[PDB]
Design an enzyme around this catalytic site. Structure first.
Site, PDB file in Angstrom:
ATOM      1  N   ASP A 131      -8.928  25.160 -41.113  1.00  0.00           N
ATOM      2  CA  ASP A 131      -8.982  25.603 -42.508  1.00  0.00           C
ATOM      3  C   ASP A 131     -10.137  26.569 -42.694  1.00  0.00           C
ATOM      4  O   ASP A 131     -10.832  26.528 -43.711  1.00  0.00           O
ATOM      5  CB  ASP A 131      -9.120  24.390 -43.446  1.00  0.00           C
ATOM      6  CG  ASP A 131      -8.737  24.703 -44.892  1.00  0.00           C
ATOM      7  OD1 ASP A 131      -8.132  25.765 -45.154  1.00  0.00           O
ATOM      8  OD2 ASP A 131      -9.040  23.867 -45.773  1.00  0.00           O
ATOM      9  N   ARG A 173     -13.524  30.484 -48.646  1.00  0.00           N
ATOM     10  CA  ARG A 173     -13.760  29.466 -49.674  1.00  0.00           C
ATOM     11  C   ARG A 173     -14.383  28.209 -49.084  1.00  0.00           C
ATOM     12  O   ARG A 173     -14.974  27.400 -49.803  1.00  0.00           O
ATOM     13  CB  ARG A 173     -12.459  29.112 -50.398  1.00  0.00           C
ATOM     14  CG  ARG A 173     -11.431  28.458 -49.501  1.00  0.00           C
ATOM     15  CD  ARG A 173     -10.147  28.138 -50.256  1.00  0.00           C
ATOM     16  NE  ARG A 173      -9.168  27.554 -49.342  1.00  0.00           N
ATOM     17  CZ  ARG A 173      -8.467  28.273 -48.477  1.00  0.00           C
ATOM     18  NH1 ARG A 173      -8.642  29.583 -48.445  1.00  0.00           N
ATOM     19  NH2 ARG A 173      -7.601  27.699 -47.647  1.00  0.00           N
ATOM     20  N   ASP A 195     -16.230  21.856 -45.215  1.00  0.00           N
ATOM     21  CA  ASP A 195     -14.869  21.336 -45.391  1.00  0.00           C
ATOM     22  C   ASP A 195     -14.220  20.907 -44.089  1.00  0.00           C
ATOM     23  O   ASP A 195     -13.395  21.621 -43.512  1.00  0.00           O
ATOM     24  CB  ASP A 195     -13.965  22.348 -46.100  1.00  0.00           C
ATOM     25  CG  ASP A 195     -12.566  21.808 -46.334  1.00  0.00           C
ATOM     26  OD1 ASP A 195     -12.454  20.680 -46.864  1.00  0.00           O
ATOM     27  OD2 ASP A 195     -11.585  22.495 -45.966  1.00  0.00           O
TER      28      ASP A 195
HETATM   29  C1  LIG Z   1     -21.109  18.194 -50.990  1.00  0.00           C
HETATM   30  C2  LIG Z   1     -20.169  18.583 -49.887  1.00  0.00           C
HETATM   31  C3  LIG Z   1     -19.832  17.685 -48.886  1.00  0.00           C
HETATM   32  C4  LIG Z   1     -18.962  18.094 -47.881  1.00  0.00           C
HETATM   33  C5  LIG Z   1     -18.417  19.379 -47.854  1.00  0.00           C
HETATM   34  O1  LIG Z   1     -17.560  19.731 -46.860  1.00  0.00           O
HETATM   35  C6  LIG Z   1     -18.725  20.299 -48.840  1.00  0.00           C
HETATM   36  C7  LIG Z   1     -19.591  19.946 -49.857  1.00  0.00           C
HETATM   37  N1  LIG Z   1     -19.903  20.873 -50.863  1.00  0.00           N
HETATM   38  C8  LIG Z   1     -18.936  21.172 -51.736  1.00  0.00           C
HETATM   39  O2  LIG Z   1     -17.759  20.581 -51.607  1.00  0.00           O
HETATM   40  C9  LIG Z   1     -19.147  22.144 -52.844  1.00  0.00           C
HETATM   41  C10 LIG Z   1     -20.468  22.797 -52.984  1.00  0.00           C
HETATM   42  C11 LIG Z   1     -21.509  22.436 -51.996  1.00  0.00           C
HETATM   43  C12 LIG Z   1     -22.868  23.020 -52.014  1.00  0.00           C
HETATM   44  N2  LIG Z   1     -23.218  23.915 -52.965  1.00  0.00           N
HETATM   45  N3  LIG Z   1     -23.733  22.617 -51.060  1.00  0.00           N
HETATM   46  C13 LIG Z   1     -23.381  21.726 -50.118  1.00  0.00           C
HETATM   47  N4  LIG Z   1     -22.162  21.160 -50.043  1.00  0.00           N
HETATM   48  C14 LIG Z   1     -21.189  21.462 -50.931  1.00  0.00           C
HETATM   49  C15 LIG Z   1     -20.744  23.798 -54.082  1.00  0.00           C
HETATM   50  C16 LIG Z   1     -19.420  24.455 -54.445  1.00  0.00           C
HETATM   51  C17 LIG Z   1     -18.449  23.380 -54.925  1.00  0.00           C
HETATM   52  C18 LIG Z   1     -18.014  22.442 -53.800  1.00  0.00           C
END
Ligand SMILES: Cc1ccc(O)cc1-n1c(=O)c2c(c3c(N)ncnc31)CCCC2
Length: 275
Positions: free
Chosen positions: A138, A142, A156
């Site tokens: 993936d 994004r 992700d």
């Molecule tokens: C919190 C998190 C956990 C696992 C993962 O795969 C992605 C995220 N995560 C996220 O899923 C997101 C954000 C984020 C961010 N600004 N910093 C760190 N992890 C993030 C900000 C944009 C909205 C979604």
């Protein structure tokens, strides 16, 4: 999970605000106090109230994967909270959010070298991921996060597996042949997204047309003012024969050279798609 993820004490976590809506519940921003007493900014994925056993397993499944990686271009897992509710995954905070939405706010505002720096980070993270035997499946702008210093990191790990049509290689679409070389195809799409400042790959073409066009040999056109070297790198990532695609190590080396002499990037490059 606890093989690869520390259990965090909820008393060490403060919630500052709700920051997005994840697949399994809201995402928040906050602070984490480490055992050394140092306080860091964190992102906090929560599992929605009333979750099923299944949702819980798939939610935490990502942390099990993330926790196996320790690399400057892969989102760092600080730990999980499972012994109290809501269940949480706590990661390093990335101030500038998802890369595609960030770039859309800044169309044509960065230098080629700045964009190459972003691209090099993503390639380095993927080199490490592929070195560990994981295919992301993936890889898309994004799903890349970018911090206050423009460092880009792979995120992700929900679709990730031990060995999205617009981002998927023809062979993975055709018969689910996912390899690190199909991730390299996706990387080529991310490269196009970055040089296009977050334009959607293949725009709003119907999926069957994206599938058929790419199979017939058509490719995304060069983004406006895209250096020939970077457009060629896209085309290389998009070779029909997966064995002809560069490896992530070679991609990193290619970008390390372009970063090294921006006087390489001076050469600029009947249908929307190109044959
Ligand atoms: C919190 C998190 C956990 C696992 C993962 O795969 C992605 C995220 N995560 C996220 O899923 C997101 C954000 C984020 C961010 N600004 N910093 C760190 N992890 C993030 C900000 C944009 C909205 C979604």
């Amino acid at each position: 999970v606890h093989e690869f993820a520390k259990e965090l004490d909820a008393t060490n976590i403060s919630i500052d605000k709700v920051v997005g809506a994840g697949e399994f519940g809201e995402v928040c921003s906050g602070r984490l106090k480490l055992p050394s007493k140092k306080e860091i900014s964190v992102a906090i994925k929560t599992l929605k109230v009333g979750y099923t056993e299944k949702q819980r397993r798939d939610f935490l499944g990502e942390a099990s994967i993330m926790g196996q990686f320790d690399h400057p271009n892969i989102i760092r897992l600080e730990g999980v909270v499972t012994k109290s509710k809501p269940v949480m995954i706590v990661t390093e905070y990335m101030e500038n959010g998802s890369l595609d939405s960030f770039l859309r706010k800044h169309d044509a505002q960065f230098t080629v070298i700045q964009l190459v720096g972003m691209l090099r980070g993503i390639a380095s993270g993927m080199k490490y991921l592929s070195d560990m035997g994981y295919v992301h499946r993936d890889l898309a702008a994004r799903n890349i996060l970018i911090n206050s210093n423009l460092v880009c990191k792979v995120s992700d790990f929900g679709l990730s597996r031990v060995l999205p049509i617009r981002w998927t290689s023809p062979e993975a679409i055709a018969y689910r042949k996912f390899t690190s070389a199909s991730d390299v195809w996706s990387y080529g799409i991310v490269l196009w997204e970055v040089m296009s400042y977050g334009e959607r790959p293949y725009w709003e073409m119907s999926n069957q047309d994206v599938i058929k066009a790419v199979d017939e040999g058509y490719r995304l056109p060069p983004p406006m003012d895209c250096p020939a070297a970077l457009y060629q790198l896209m085309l290389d990532c998009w070779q029909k024969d997966r064995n002809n695609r560069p490896k992530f190590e070679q991609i990193v080396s290619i970008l390390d050279k372009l970063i090294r002499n921006p006087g390489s990037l001076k050469i600029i490059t009947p249908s929307n798609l190109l044959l």
